[PDB]
């Protein structure tokens, strides 16, 4: 007639529940999840004894636990998170060239590119959930991390995606306090701008950091930079990537609707990771759209 299970919103604060085995999880707790799976319309099974189930933050204390773990106020988050998990737990996360990648599935090229990128850039997350999941991802267990990335990016599994937007959302939940950017426009008169938060490390309209320092078009040029990396993005275009001149890059092949992402890293030679696939070469030219670089500080 009963079993003892645990209910949680963060899988940190576990709450003991006695569950009647004659009623579904849905009737007793509302939407209920077991490792991403929806058990709402399912009655308890004997194998569920002792197991931890996700519920939704329907009171105030659960909302606070959810905020302090996910740094989110969105109630659907948990639900969306769970959905992603149920799929991303079945993905494969092989090591390629010393990095955790994703075997291709559900149109996830942009997630694999973003993940490899994050692993090659100095970035600490703010939300405890992201910290724990990213730690586990770097160790080859990236299911939770990817499901969370989907959840924060308000994207569902199987849906094509943009790496630059993904990095945008991620950086918003990252510690960029030590970052600052300063630019100028050369319109009559001095027009210096200081940029903080995401816009201190992201730029759209050229792949070339050095061009950003020389100026793009009125002309705008980088006066000062304090960050551990930078991301230079531009609409996909033919571009040459020379070993040692960059850290990594996103290649996009296709049109605005249907496309494919590959990842270019600068180790000893140029490496190209495409999910589980890996190739090497001495040089590379192709359609690039994001290029990452390592900076500590810059002054024009
Ligand atoms: C980096 C690239 C991009 C960025 C900027 C301009 C682009 C022009 C043409 C093609 C790609 C361009 N980016 C790649 C991923 C794209 C994407 O997620 N497409 C999904 C999609 C699916 C259906 C309709 C749609 F408008 C968009 C969005 C665009
Ligand atoms: Zn509690
Ligand atoms: Zn059964
Ligand atoms: Zn906090
Ligand atoms: Zn699936």
Residue numbers in the entry: 3 to 188, 191 to 221, 230 to 312
Publication excerpt:
As a conserved papain-like Cys protease from the C16 family, PLpro hydrolyses amino acid sequences with a specific Leu-Xaa-Gly-Gly motif, found at the junctions between nsp1/2, nsp2/3 and nsp3/4 (where Xaa is Asn, Lys or Lys, respectively). Importantly, the same motif is present within a subset of human proteins that are also targeted by PLpro/nsp3; most notable are the C-terminus of human ubiquitin and the ubiquitin-like modifier, Interferon Stimulated Gene 15 (ISG15) that comprise a Leu-Arg-Gly-Gly motif.
We co-crystallized 3k with a mutant form of SARS-CoV-2 PLpro in which the catalytic Cys111 was changed to Ser (PLproC111S), which we and others found to yield a more stable enzyme. The best crystal diffracted to 2.66 Å, and structure determination by molecular replacement revealed the structure of the PLpro bound to 3k. The (R)-enantiomer of the compound was used for co-crystallisation and lies in the binding site. Tyr268 at the turn of BL2 restrains the central piperidine ring, almost entirely burying it in the enzyme; the piperidine amino group further forms a hydrogen bond with the side chain of Asp164 of the Thumb domain. The naphthyl ring extends into a hydrophobic pocket towards the ubiquitin binding bowl in PLpro, packing against Pro247 and Pro248. On the other side of the molecule extending towards the catalytic Cys, a substituted phenyl group is connected to the para-position of the piperidine ring by an amide-linker that forms interactions with both the domain and BL2, including through a key hydrogen bond between the compound amide and the backbone carbonyl of BL2 Tyr268. The substituted phenyl ring extends outwards from the domain core, due to side-chain rotation of Leu162, which blocks the path to the catalytic Cys111.
